[PDB]
Design a protein around this nucleic acid. Structure first.
Ligand SMILES: [Zn+2]
Ligand SMILES: [Zn+2]
Lengths: 97, 146, 49, 209, 114, 321, 8, 192, 243
DNA sequence: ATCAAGCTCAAGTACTTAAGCCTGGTCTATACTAGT
RNA sequence: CAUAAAGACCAGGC
DNA sequence: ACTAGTAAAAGTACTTGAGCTTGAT
């Protein structure tokens, strides 16, 4: 989907309008729970993987179980899930966040 | 000038390139007065000023100033064959000469404003839409009217 | 008649006439009056752009 | 002269090969990447008093899922075409038993010939194109999205899993150059797949009438 | 190029073709008057529009008090050291910002561009 | 007033809101493919190959003489090259017509367009008929002259002075040497912003901007321009949406229309959301054709009679209904 | 009133 | 002296006035910078332009340094007489004084032949505001009558009054424009 | 009666007399009194009369129109306007391409246009040399003679004065039945409303020939690009209507 | 060799259209002809 | 409580 | 005599006009 973004956005920009601001929403959680960014952390990464998968399943635009009412679900919540798995992945949140 | 045959409201336009002469005696034209310049000096001498501050007991007024040949009425068509000097003390001296053959001269260059724009102090310091706003607002200022 | 009502024409042709001439003198301030007695006007219609 | 005209004949021929490749027929890959020199050595150098006549440029192709369905591509000789040439081509189609046909008209038609193309409707459906129109494939353009023609069961799940009627869809008239590129008659639904900046991809539908 | 009038009825003369002596003749469509051609041509259509302004500016324009004046350019015919310059004031505004000079000595009226 | 000539602001908005068939300044941005996109002189003869050139743009004067025999030559110099023609004279089969036409050519506008007398005289003979005869000089000389005679095969009413002035004032305006007749002037520039440059993913994976030569016209005819060699058929667009509706389709007017509204909104640095431009452009082109936002687009729809009467045509809608 | 690119 | 070569796309008049407007427009922004770098910290013009409550950086330049250059009908002040602008100048004059370059400020006051030009420019800028409102207020009625019943149904579809479908999901995603923000994806841009 | 004017009961007084009558000494006057209220006449703008104008309207086949609003010295209930137009270059036709642009005229009380040489030949002056010494004033400029040549070569067949007055007088508000009514109506229109400010009396049509030759000569100066066009907004082309 | 039938493209001639809301003012009911 | 018509033009305010 | 009847572009919609193709010959 890195290669999908280079044909949805052929020019090169990155300022894209989406729902809830994610950097501000990881930066609030670093202060509600007093995150010391100097210690080793206790977030095991295959809680991250199934976390992003089970949340990405709970974002239904088109309520449908059958095909053709399940593929438009994946066309609707497509750019937001590329953005969601882009920002909230395993390396970038065990290292930077 | 000195009023032999012709009443002072006609206009006599000569365009040299077109090779024709137009003379208008028709009604409805609009005009304003100016001061004649000779070779380079004006014609309004001080002899015309010292007996003009004495109007209450001398019988000398604006019509003796027209009939002496020192002011003259110029209208809009004849303001295209004219060469005005806007002020005598700065534009008719011996300097780096812009023009050397002026044919008229204004009285004072603040006589281009109307009745409601002559009640604005310092209009050359304001932004001109503000002058247009107050030139329609001293028409509804409560005062004494008559 | 045609001084009293503005419509610069006849009474029985009161819609083919150029109105707005001969209007009521203005008496708020003395310079309102001196401006109203010295006023020009052009007959181009006032919806054109 | 003649090099521009054989350039036109190569580019028209290549356009028709992608066209019947997109309609769902059997096209060899060698004549899709056909460079100008393989055309120029195969059919001839110059059409000015020459070997590519506008005859022996005709193309007969066959459908994939059924070997019976064939389509003929006619390149008429005279600039404007009357009724008599349409009766010639319709005669050759009569004896050869083929239904579909294209007529790449050089300069233009006559309206009684066009009425002589719309009148045989239930059998012998002929299509009319123009030389000036076929020099660029409009499906590869920047603005034109992906059109996919839909079969009847898929129209049944469209009109059954949105609980629509058939008139409540958006529409498209069958005279724009894309529905003449796909050869679509009244009653058929095209699917348009275009990428958007709010969701990423959007699939909309159109009824052709 | 020019124009031709008749000597009897005073109307316009036209060019005609008579096929005997191979000569262009001018005739009249009113009377029966003939005369031969002196220039042996009809028509001239200057597309370039390169007409010269020196045959259309008048010597009287030096009597104008609203035009600039120069000491630096003298005349050639009379040696007078005062002139008046102006632009094209005409058609063909393709590249028309040249400068035409008129001598201001009376009874000379000499005209030159640079 | 402050910014070529392109309309913006309010009048271009009211050109896009209806579908006005004559926009006040249409144009056609032209991209290039190969070696022509980088070098300036091959872009210059693509520039020459698109812009319309009538014959009167490369003429000096036309002068009708009277030479009854070509061996007379009242013209004071031209006996040399018609004497070269007199070494072997050709086409004296019927007669010799005396009435002559004579065009001088201007070599700045001629050599500016890489033209010569051989393809001009090829065009004004092959294309008009055989009713004329076009002789010309050699390119050694400074002046470029071409003599034209009418064909003798009619002389063996139609007076040829009026006729020859008629074709003289018809060949000056209706000859079309080069170019496309709808396109009147083509410019040439290479952009500074990145929205008209060529953006390539490099080998390492980096978005690179490349300066390219683009042409941009005054007048629109898209189908002949897409069909021209050394022109990119993918990226060439325009701003006349009824002409894109003629050439490309209906989805291309949806997307080109969305791009034009976004172009007039975002010129003063403003920002309107995307749902609104998609809803307007998706309602305006929903039923197949260009439903203009006027009286004549909405009042010809399947909406009821009590909705059209509150829009501009009350009693006429009520009486047809 | 400023310049050609500005405002009148 | 017949020595000015034209530019591609322009006549001789257009290359002349374009490079004169280039010179004069590049020499009033310089005076603007000389005014901007010569203010103070206790100043109040600067304390309004910075804070964003009122003012702009061209008003400081017109009040302090140079008012600028006026223009009617999108170009420099035209020859309203024959070959002159006002009857004080000489015929066919093209300098900066003769055609509207106001080189004084609002505090040094204006000369008469310059206050008249500034009145012309302010007049044009008042006509445009006087005229534009009817055309804009007519467009904004014609659109709102053309679109007035398009709405979101209980199927998350955006249907007409005749129920004929306009969009399958609203805004091509399904979301309302009240609760969205700008974000960055940061996957498309970097190297491999 | 306008107040403070010479036919008022307040002219030439002093301040105590004006204050005695309960009038203000400052109040400038210049207003009427009708049924109690006080009216004032606004001066109405007007375009100047008896002057020859040339414009260029980008609407029709007329490429340069002249105008002359004529008034016979403050005695005219209408105003008699005479145009002299000139037709287009790009008229689609296989004959006019070599012919050229023709000069016309739109006389008052004649709805269809009339070509010029017919109007000049309704005023006498039957020869063409005399008509082209009234319409152009020098005979050494070859450009200005070619510019009027199709206007001559259109009106060759009407080459008599009396059939020219039948031609001009044939198209009135209602055409005459016989011929002498048509030459009557043509002579009274073409002498009494053709240019009233030049002459109304039944002699001296030579001065109308010189002035109409001047009007068409001015159209040929502004068609050959030798002069500018006249400006409508020029405030030397206006007059003002007071009381 | 010309002759109607049917049709298409082009030019000429009318109809319809122009921001919202709010507050004061003066004038006018037809001048002219037959019943009564 | 009830009754103060209605149309045309004009000068203004945001 | 007094007093009541009293005659500015700009989009579309419709019409005419010229010329073509074609079956007949
Ligand atoms: Zn003669
Ligand atoms: Zn000299």
């Amino acid at each position: 989907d890195r290669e999908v973004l280079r044909v949805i956005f052929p020019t090169g920009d990155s300022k894209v309008v989406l729902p809830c601001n994610l950097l501000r929403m990881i930066w609030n959680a670093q202060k509600i729970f007093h995150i010391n960014p100097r210690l080793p952390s206790d977030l095991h990464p295959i809680k991250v993987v199934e976390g992003v998968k089970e949340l990405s399943k709970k974002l239904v635009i088109v309520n449908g179980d059958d095909p053709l009412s399940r593929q438009a679900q994946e066309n609707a919540t497509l750019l937001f899930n590329i953005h969601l798995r882009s920002t909230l992945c395993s390396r970038r949140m065990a290292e930077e966040f | 000038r000195q009023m032999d045959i012709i009443v002072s409201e006609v206009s006599m336009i000569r365009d040299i390139r077109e090779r024709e002469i137009r003379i208008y005696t028709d009604a409805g034209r609009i005009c304003r007065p100016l001061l004649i310049v000779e070779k380079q000096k004006l014609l309004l001498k001080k002899r015309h000023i010292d007996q003009l501050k004495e109007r209450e007991y001398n019988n000398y007024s604006w019509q003796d100033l027209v009939a002496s040949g020192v002011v003259e009425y110029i209208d809009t068509l004849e303001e295209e064959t004219v060469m005005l000097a806007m002020t005598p003390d700065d534009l008719q001296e011996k300097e780096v000469a812009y023009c050397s053959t002026y044919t008229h001269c204004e009285i004072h260059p603040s006589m281009i404003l109307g009745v409601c724009a002559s009640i604005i102090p310092f209009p050359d310091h304001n932004q001109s839409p503000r002058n247009t706003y107050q030139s329609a607002m001293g028409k509804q200022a409560m005062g004494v009217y008559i | 008649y045609s001084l009293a009502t503005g419509n610069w024409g006849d009474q029985k042709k009161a819609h083919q006439a150029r109105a707005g001439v001969s209007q009521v003198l203005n008496r708020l301030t003395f310079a309102s009056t001196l401006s109203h007695l010295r006023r020009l006007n052009s007959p181009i219609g006032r919806d054109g752009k | 002269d003649d090099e521009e005209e054989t350039y036109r004949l190569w580019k028209i021929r290549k356009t028709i090969m992608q066209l019947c490749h997109d309609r769902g027929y059997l096209v060899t890959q060698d004549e899709l990447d056909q460079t100008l020199e393989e055309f120029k050595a195969q059919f001839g150098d110059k059409p000015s008093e020459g070997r590519p006549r506008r005859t022996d440029l005709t193309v007969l192709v066959a459908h994939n899922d059924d070997p019976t369905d064939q389509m003929f591509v006619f390149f008429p000789e005279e600039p404007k075409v009357g009724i008599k040439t349409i009766k010639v081509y319709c005669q050759r189609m009569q004896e050869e038993n083929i239904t579909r046909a294209l007529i790449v008209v050089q300069q233009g038609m006559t309206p009684s010939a066009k009425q002589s193309l719309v009148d045989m409707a239930p059998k012998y459906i002929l299509e009319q194109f123009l030389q000036q129109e076929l020099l660029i494939n409009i499906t590869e353009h920047e603005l034109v999205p992906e059109h996919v023609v839909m079969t009847k069961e898929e129209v049944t799940e469209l009109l059954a899993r949105y609980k629509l009627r058939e008139n409540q869809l958006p529409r498209i008239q069958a005279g724009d150059p894309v529905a003449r590129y796909f050869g679509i008659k009244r009653g058929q639904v095209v699917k348009i797949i275009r990428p958007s900046e709010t969701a990423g991809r959007y699939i909309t539908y159109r009824l052709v009438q | 190029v020019g124009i031709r009038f008749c000597q009897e009825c005073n109307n316009m003369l036209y060019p005609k073709e008579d096929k005997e002596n191979r000569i262009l003749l001018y005739a009249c469509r009113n009377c029966d008057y003939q005369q031969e051609a002196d220039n042996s041509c009809i028509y001239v259509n200057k597309i370039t529009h390169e007409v010269d302004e020196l045959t259309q500016i008048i010597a009287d324009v030096s009597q104008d008090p609203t035009l600039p004046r120069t000491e630096d350019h003298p005349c050639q015919k009379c040696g007078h050291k005062e002139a008046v310059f102006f632009q094209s004031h005409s058609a063909r505004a393709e590249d028309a910002m040249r400068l035409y000079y008129v001598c201001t000595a009376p009874h000379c009226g000499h005209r030159w561009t640079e | 007033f402050h910014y070529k000539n392109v309309t913006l602001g309010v009048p271009r908005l009211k050109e896009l809101i209806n579908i006005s068939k004559k926009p006040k300044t249409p144009s056609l941005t032209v991209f290039l493919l190969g070696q022509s996109a980088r070098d300036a002189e091959r872009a210059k003869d693509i520039l020459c190959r698109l812009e319309h050139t009538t014959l009167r743009k490369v003429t000096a004067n036309t002068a009708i003489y009277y030479d009854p025999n070509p061996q007379s030559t009242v013209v004071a110099e031209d006996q040399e090259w018609v004497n070269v023609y007199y070494e072997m004279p050709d086409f004296d089969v019927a007669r010799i017509s005396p009435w002559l036409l004579r065009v001088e050519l201007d070599r700045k506008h001629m050599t500016d367009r890489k033209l010569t007398m051989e393809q001009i005289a090829e065009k004004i003979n092959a294309g008009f008929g055989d009713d004329l005869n076009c002789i010309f000089n050699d390119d050694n000389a400074e002046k470029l002259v071409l003599r034209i005679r009418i064909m003798n095969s009619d002389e063996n009413k139609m007076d040829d002075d009026v006729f020859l002035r008629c074709i003289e004032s018809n060949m000056l305006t209706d000859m079309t040497l080069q170019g496309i007749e709808q396109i009147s002037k083509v410019y040439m520039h290479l952009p500074q912003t990145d929205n008209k440059k060529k953006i390539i993913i490099t080998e390492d994976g980096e978005f690179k901007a490349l300066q390219e030569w683009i042409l941009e016209t005054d007048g629109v005819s898209l189908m002949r321009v897409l069909s021209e060699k050394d022109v990119d058929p993918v990226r060439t667009t325009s701003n006349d949406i009824v002409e894109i509706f003629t050439v490309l389709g209906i989805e291309a007017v949806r997307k080109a229309l969305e791009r034009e509204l976004y172009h007039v909104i975002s010129f003063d640095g403003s920002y309107v959301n995307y749902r609104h431009l998609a809803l307007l452009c998706d309602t305006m082109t929903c039923r197949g054709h260009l439903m203009a936002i006027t009286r004549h687009g909405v009042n010809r729809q399947d909406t009821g009679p009590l909705m059209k009467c509150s829009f501009e045509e009350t009693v006429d809608v009520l009486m047809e209904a | 009133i400023w310049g050609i690119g500005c405002n009148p | 002296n017949n020595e000015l070569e034209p530019t591609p796309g322009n006549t001789l008049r257009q290359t002349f006035e374009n490079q004169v407007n280039r010179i004069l427009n590049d020499a009033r922004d310089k005076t603007g910078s000389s005014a901007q770098k010569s203010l103070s910290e206790y100043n109040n013009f600067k304390s309004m332009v910075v804070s964003g409550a009122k003012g702009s950086k061209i008003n400081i330049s017109q009040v302090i340094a140079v008012v600028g250059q006026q223009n009617v009908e999108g170009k420099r002040i035209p020859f309203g007489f024959k070959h002159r602008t006002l009857p004080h100048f000489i015929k066919d004059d093209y300098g900066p004084e003769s055609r509207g370059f106001v080189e004084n400020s609002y505090l040094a006051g204006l000369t008469p032949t310059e206050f008249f030009f500034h009145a012309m420019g302010g007049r044009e800028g008042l006509i445009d505001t006087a005229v534009k409102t009817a055309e804009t207020g007519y467009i904004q009625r014609r659109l709102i009558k053309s679109m007035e019943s398009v709405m979101v149904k209980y199927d998350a579809t955006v249907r007409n009054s005749i129920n004929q479908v306009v969009q399958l999901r609203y805004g091509e995603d399904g979301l309302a424009g009240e609760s969205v923000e700008f974000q960055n994806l940061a996957t498309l841009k970097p190297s491999n | 009666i306008m107040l403070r004017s010479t036919y008022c009961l307040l002219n030439g007084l002093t301040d105590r007399d004006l204050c005695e009558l309960n009038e203000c000494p400052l109040d400038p006057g210049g207003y009427f009194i009708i049924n109690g209220s006080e009216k004032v006449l606004i001066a109405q703008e007007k375009m100047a009369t008896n002057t020859v104008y040339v414009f260029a309207k980008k609407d029709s086949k007329y490429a340069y129109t002249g105008e002359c609003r004529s008034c016979l010295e403050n005695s005219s209930r209408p105003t008699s306007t005479i145009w002299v137009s000139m037709l287009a270059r790009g008229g689609q036709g296989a004959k006019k391409s070599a012919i050229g642009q023709r000069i016309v005229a739109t006389l008052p009380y004649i709805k269809q246009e009339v070509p010029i040489i017919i109007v000049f030949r309704a005023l006498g002056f039957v020869s063409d040399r005399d008509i082209l010494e009234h319409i152009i004033y020098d005979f050494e400029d070859p450009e200005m003679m070619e510019m009027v040549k199709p206007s001559l070569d259109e009106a060759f067949v009407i080459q008599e004065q009396n059939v020219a007055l039948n031609f001009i007088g044939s198209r009135g508000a209602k055409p005459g039945v016989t011929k002498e009514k048509r030459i009557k109506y043509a002579k009274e229109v073409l002498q009494k409303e053709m240019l009233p400010h030049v002459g109304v009396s039944d002699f001296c049509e030579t001065k109308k020939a010189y002035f109409l030759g001047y009007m068409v000569h001015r159209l040929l100066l502004a068609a050959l690009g030798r002069r500018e066009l006249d400006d409508r907004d020029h405030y030397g082309n206006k007059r003002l209507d007071l009381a």
